Design an enzyme around this catalytic site. Sequence first.
Site, PDB file in Angstrom:
ATOM      1  N   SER A 187      37.208  75.750  61.207  1.00 15.57           N
ATOM      2  CA  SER A 187      36.305  75.144  62.144  1.00 15.57           C
ATOM      3  C   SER A 187      34.968  75.833  62.270  1.00 15.57           C
ATOM      4  O   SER A 187      33.935  75.162  62.315  1.00 15.57           O
ATOM      5  CB  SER A 187      36.953  74.973  63.506  1.00 15.57           C
ATOM      6  OG  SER A 187      36.308  73.944  64.250  1.00 15.57           O
ATOM      7  N   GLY A 188      34.986  77.142  62.293  1.00 17.39           N
ATOM      8  CA  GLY A 188      33.690  77.829  62.478  1.00 17.39           C
ATOM      9  C   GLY A 188      33.052  78.385  61.236  1.00 17.39           C
ATOM     10  O   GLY A 188      31.997  79.011  61.291  1.00 17.39           O
ATOM     11  N   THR A 245      29.599  72.111  56.881  1.00 18.35           N
ATOM     12  CA  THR A 245      28.616  71.009  56.971  1.00 18.35           C
ATOM     13  C   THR A 245      27.288  71.469  56.488  1.00 18.35           C
ATOM     14  O   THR A 245      26.650  70.842  55.633  1.00 18.35           O
ATOM     15  CB  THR A 245      28.441  70.430  58.397  1.00 18.35           C
ATOM     16  OG1 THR A 245      29.558  70.666  59.217  1.00 18.35           O
ATOM     17  CG2 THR A 245      28.111  68.931  58.321  1.00 18.35           C
ATOM     18  N   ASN A 254      36.517  73.357  70.123  1.00 18.84           N
ATOM     19  CA  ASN A 254      35.164  72.909  69.939  1.00 18.84           C
ATOM     20  C   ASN A 254      34.888  71.747  70.907  1.00 18.84           C
ATOM     21  O   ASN A 254      35.800  71.235  71.552  1.00 18.84           O
ATOM     22  CB  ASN A 254      34.891  72.470  68.531  1.00 18.84           C
ATOM     23  CG  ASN A 254      33.449  72.490  68.203  1.00 18.84           C
ATOM     24  OD1 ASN A 254      32.662  72.641  69.102  1.00 18.84           O
ATOM     25  ND2 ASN A 254      33.111  72.330  66.932  1.00 18.84           N
ATOM     26  N   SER A 266      34.598  68.657  67.685  1.00 17.52           N
ATOM     27  CA  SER A 266      35.416  68.989  66.539  1.00 17.52           C
ATOM     28  C   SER A 266      35.567  67.873  65.565  1.00 17.52           C
ATOM     29  O   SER A 266      35.656  66.716  65.936  1.00 17.52           O
ATOM     30  CB  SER A 266      36.756  69.483  66.950  1.00 17.52           C
ATOM     31  OG  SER A 266      37.272  70.408  65.995  1.00 17.52           O
ATOM     32  N   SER A 267      35.552  68.228  64.284  1.00 18.50           N
ATOM     33  CA  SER A 267      35.703  67.265  63.189  1.00 18.50           C
ATOM     34  C   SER A 267      37.176  66.867  63.085  1.00 18.50           C
ATOM     35  O   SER A 267      38.026  67.675  62.736  1.00 18.50           O
ATOM     36  CB  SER A 267      35.255  67.892  61.885  1.00 18.50           C
ATOM     37  OG  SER A 267      34.264  67.067  61.279  1.00 18.50           O
ATOM     38  N   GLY A 317      40.591  73.260  55.994  1.00 16.21           N
ATOM     39  CA  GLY A 317      41.564  74.000  55.286  1.00 16.21           C
ATOM     40  C   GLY A 317      42.697  74.285  56.165  1.00 16.21           C
ATOM     41  O   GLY A 317      42.577  74.223  57.377  1.00 16.21           O
ATOM     42  N   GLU A 350      45.127  75.410  58.372  1.00 17.13           N
ATOM     43  CA  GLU A 350      45.026  76.155  59.603  1.00 17.13           C
ATOM     44  C   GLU A 350      46.434  76.172  60.194  1.00 17.13           C
ATOM     45  O   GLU A 350      47.250  75.228  60.106  1.00 17.13           O
ATOM     46  CB  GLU A 350      43.965  75.603  60.568  1.00 17.13           C
ATOM     47  CG  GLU A 350      42.593  76.289  60.272  1.00 17.13           C
ATOM     48  CD  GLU A 350      41.553  76.147  61.341  1.00 17.13           C
ATOM     49  OE1 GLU A 350      40.964  74.974  61.322  1.00 17.13           O
ATOM     50  OE2 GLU A 350      41.262  77.078  62.096  1.00 17.13           O
TER      51      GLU A 350
END
Lengths: 145, 150, 804
Positions: free
Chosen positions: C178-179, C183, C224, C227-228, C450, C452
Amino acid sequence: DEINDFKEAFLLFDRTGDAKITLSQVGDIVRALGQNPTNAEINKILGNPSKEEMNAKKITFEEFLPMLQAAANNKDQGTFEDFVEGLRVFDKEGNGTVMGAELRHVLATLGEKMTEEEVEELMKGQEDSNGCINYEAFVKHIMSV
Amino acid sequence: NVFSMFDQTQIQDFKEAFTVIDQNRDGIIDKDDLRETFAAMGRLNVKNEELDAMIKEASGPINFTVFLTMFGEKLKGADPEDVIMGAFKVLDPDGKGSIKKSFLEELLTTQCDRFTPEEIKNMWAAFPPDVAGNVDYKNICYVITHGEDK
Amino acid sequence: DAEMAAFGEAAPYLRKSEKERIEAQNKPFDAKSSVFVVHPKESFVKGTIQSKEGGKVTVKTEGGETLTVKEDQVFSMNPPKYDKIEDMAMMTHLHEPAVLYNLKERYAAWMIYTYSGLFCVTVNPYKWLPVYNPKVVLAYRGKKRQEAPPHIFSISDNAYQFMLTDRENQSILITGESGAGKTVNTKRVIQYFATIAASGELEDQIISANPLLEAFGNAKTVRNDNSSRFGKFIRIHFGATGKLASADIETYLLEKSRVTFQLPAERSYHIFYQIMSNKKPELIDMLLITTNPYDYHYVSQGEITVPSIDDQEELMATDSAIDILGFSADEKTAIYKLTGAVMHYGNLKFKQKQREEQAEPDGTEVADKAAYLMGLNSAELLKALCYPRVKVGNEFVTKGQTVSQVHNSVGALAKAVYEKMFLWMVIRINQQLDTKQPRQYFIGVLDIAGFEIFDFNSFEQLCINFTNEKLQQFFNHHMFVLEQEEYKKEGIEWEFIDFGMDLAACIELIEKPMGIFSILEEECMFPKATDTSFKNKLYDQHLGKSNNFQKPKPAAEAHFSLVHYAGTVDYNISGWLEKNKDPLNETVIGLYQKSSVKTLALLFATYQTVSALFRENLNKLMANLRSTHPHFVRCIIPNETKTPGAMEHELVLHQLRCNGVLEGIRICRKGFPSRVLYADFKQRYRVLNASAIPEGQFMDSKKASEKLLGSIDVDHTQYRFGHTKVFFKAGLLGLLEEMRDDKLAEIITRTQARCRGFLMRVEYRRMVERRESIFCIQYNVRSFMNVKHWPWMKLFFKIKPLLK
């Protein structure tokens, strides 16, 4: 011990006039009286005890001559066979090819060392402008004393 | 010892030197012969004790042979200049520019018993400047064969 | 230094000064003592070996600490020559620590790009860098990755190159947590393409894309705020010449379950909240909804508002994006209208028919709206829903459902519809990103999450993990293929099995017929199934019979663990059935298929469960990935705390395992690293047993090396010969040398001596010569000292001149 000439040669390296040479000069006088000894071997017996070697060769002829004979026994290693061959192992590219730089550093930095001065003096006009030195001729000029 | 180094040339230099001090041409130099050779060289202040001191060194009339023996006897370890230069040329072995003070200091003291450290300091003072600069062996040889000022 | 100019300003962040290097590689090192070690608090710290407990080790630390740890809690340390290696895979020490440590060091130096084999590791700077510098872009232009330092444009250019050179399509796989900041990269890669090969004799659409997808595939996660949920795949279709021609987007997992559910601190997709924000009041009346989300169960199970987000602003952003994206108003109308139907569905209510266990509609209030909004008929709709008319045998058998069965089927469509739509939008986007000009190849840029691992792994996790475990195998193979070429090119003799194979076990269990998904998607067809039901079916069939299948070890809750390449994931099965229903009631789909709302009609022409697509999409993808030359990029996140130049250990360590980085190192360390060319082998080592002589000297450049290895108390395993060279494992060649080392001491020490000897032997010849010349000098002086004071001699002196 025995022979005569070597006693005459001792006085030539007295450098005081006393006929009593030092335990350090010991290691060098042995080198010209016929045959080679390594430094580590000289340092091993009688060399490693300072007071005993000073009272067993920093002395008169009495202990010079027995130490020199002790070295005389191991000198079979004078065999040249291995010592042209060992050299070809460093720079093998056709003939007995060497490079100045490789013998100069290898014989100053490794094993028993050698001063840069002494190595420059082994290279006495046997390594001309070409950079490459010819091995086979050096073992002959080295062993030629 | 005094007839064994001592070449014909050295001996002729001495014979001519004797005939220049030999004023009378007789064959024997005496007090009179010494007095006017000193006078001819400019020295007028000569006292009898100095003339007498000179002569006293010999047991008889100073005759060519008595001279040559007396002068040889003082130079019992003295060669002609070229021979002395050879010894230095061997120490030079590379050639032309002469040696350094340390190199010979050690070689006069080392092999054998002694060229003593009193003798060697006298050497650097009586052999110079020369011994400091180039240990000027050329100069060293000329001063021992030809006098101190030269 | 000389080279670097192009970058110049960036240089310091790409490469180090030629002495900084030099000062680092050429420094003192004590191998036998210097080491890396385990550490209870900090993962692995460095130290010096002090003693040796026979199978225990005591070490000092770098900070000052002493620990006695096992023999295998201890790991070697690379010679300084490998300081901040561009390619860690060149290291002679393939460990866990050395990798962590290399990354770390070149980061503290502000180098974010370091390679680890094929990968292109990237670490979040957390600050600004001249790297994306418009000078760099050129610099990296036309350069193999060996002609320039580690950087993304390297990857990105090479792709291009390769693209035209080999006439094959390419891909770039960006992946991280996530971090990690993907992008950013993705975007940055994209610009790169656009720049270096433009034929606009997009840039916004390209951009505008995001904000649409984000409204639909993004949401407030407890982690987040945006979040995606999304992933993406762009196909940049390059032309024949090599100039830009088309693009193609595809969206994945914006997480079908959100549409119907939501955790307590979370919320659903933005769109919903965007729309009910009221910035475009028509919309509210148009969709037939209110502005209060608590009227739509599906979307207010968690939270409704987020302070950091301005739903009103976004609504437009979104709106405007649609337009730019070239959508038809109608479509732009479908989208909206369709997004509201879904809300309504969750409001659809039912009741038990009396004396019957059947479901009967509890009103035609909502259905009416849903029906209208979708271009359907209220009735026809409620029937199909209640009296699903199936086709068992060779006919069509009308089946009755339960209340519980309906509620669940509805949810299944809701999800189904949303998804599809989302997929469509992507396609449509891609279409604009549609030209007529010919296309010869493309470069795919894949951005997804990926693997997680969370203490809580639900449905969504499986879907993603599954994606990744596939992607991984995809690599492991490419590497196997790749590796094997070298040993073929060189002539080494190394045999090995595909590295992918190791993972096939896990994949089959998920995707195969009696596997998880199936059992998952079947039960979805049972009008009266339970999560619990599903669960049992899962076990009865896989438990004890399948190795990768396991029952959770209590330590939330868990129903089943799987053994993925990265590790064991504990999965919780609760909501799945639902989430998965959005198995699909085909009667209804029928209706969609003949809607008055074309778009809706379209979405369902290829005709159902949620996971049913995910798979279809994931297949269409992994297939596109194959007709591609894979190019890998692994994005990394230094510290949870957001600090440049810093790194938590175990945090980076994690990523590394789940990344594939640590697996690429593994596979690396299995082959035969160092490979010696035969002559190069003779010369350097003949000396070791040089006598393996008459038959080793009358000889061959190859057969020799063969023969040589005859001697030595060495592992005759560790190596392998072949047509042009020998293959060797690690620390072997190291072993060789050592022996060699001793052998020269011999050789040298002896050669020294003679010299030494000889040296003095000439001194005597000189000393002796000198003998007399001294004397001559000796005596000669003495004379003078005596004489020079003698009358007679002074006399001779003044007089000596007058002579001739």
